[PDB]
């Protein structure tokens with residue numbers, strides 16, 4: 549039995565999941581979400597507040613287990629500074645043929661790591677985009693083959709070295725166990741997509757708090773990664789501005805009553821407190837949905853630029869359109885009727901992403917969070933890119 553603690557560090561919530569694996573079998577042992585403190589705009593802005601928020605989650609998880617289990621950690625975070633980088637590493641053995649070994653592959657991959665580091669970048673995910681043996685044949689796994697020459701093109705999802713170091717050092721400090729750091733957006737895609745979507749082409753739109761993350765898959769791997777710098781935080785701010793209420797009351801209103809489609813709504817009255825925390829004010833669910841709307845149309849319209857960019861890259865491989873359409877994830881994916889709005893914008897199939905609707909293995913007792921789009925990355929963290 550191996551145990552994993554997966555943590556997905558968002559700028560509004562930190563989510564955690566403890567899993568156990570035996571043979572082919574997985575079970576969920578604990579899960580929770582806490583308020584995030586000290587992160588903003590993809591950066592730790594208050595390390596002491598960050599540490600305490602993380603600690604608060606670990607304490608919940610341990611109360612659920614009732615046992616002080618050892619596990620290995622996998623921890624993901626979001627950032628607008630994720631980028632895709634391509635690196636080629638070549639080994640020429642001259643005249644003789646030799647067996648390609650785990651040693652040779654491990655060394656070539658170390659080399660690609662150093663080449664990205666020399667360029668001030670650290671990969672959170674690295675995989676091979678192509679193996680080429682003797683300048684003439686493409687293989688998918690070169691292990692035990694014979695070649696005089698091997699070239700490997702790696703695709704990496706990287707962040708700046710200094711971003712990596714800050715997270716690594718604070719986390720090591722807090723988590724007192726071996727850990728690996730990952731991209732929340734890559735792990736979201738791994739937690740929610742099916743294998744035929746990842747192979748034939750699909751776009752994940754992550755409706756997060758500080759910004760909307762965008763990632764596209766083809767041939768089983770990420771082919772493009774980007775963002776729109778407008779997220780649920782701006783929707784919250786719009787409501788707080790029109791109603792004159794606190795950030796917290798505006799988010800409560802959105803989560804409680806928000807709808808992405810307003811044009812058929814009744815004028816149901818809803819109540820909230822003004823900034824003095826005391827006066828009761830009144831609006832309608834329709835009116836709240838009118839605010840929400842404009843900003844969500846904005847986010848989906850700017851994400852459509854990325855969708856069309858991908859659609860061009862995918863059509864070059866002989867696909868018609870992006871066959872998988874759009875999968876919506878993150879907190880904003882829980883707004884009622886968001887898929888209806890996204891379908892009007894994208895003119896494409898749109899579904900909600902969650903671990904339950906991927907084709908990943910059933911996890912015993914995981915249902916409550918397997919069905920939650922904001923837990924996708926927490927699951928995806930325990931799986932790797934093809």
Ligand SMILES: Nc1ncnc2c1ncn2[C@@H]1O[C@H](COP(=O)(O)OP(=O)(O)OP(O)(O)=S)[C@@H](O)[C@H]1O
Pocket residue numbers: 557558559560561562584626732755756757758759779780781784799802803804806878879880882883884922
């Ligand atoms: N049921 C809900 N209905 C509507 N909105 C919700 C719901 N639950 C959460 N949200 C919204 O989603 C925002 C949080 O989104 P999440 O994706 O969980 O944030 P995050 O994971 O902390 O963000 P990232 O990944 O750092 S940019 C919240 O502020 C709410 O506005």
Ligand SMILES: [Mg+2]
Pocket residue numbers: 557558559626732756878
């Ligand atoms: Mg997130």
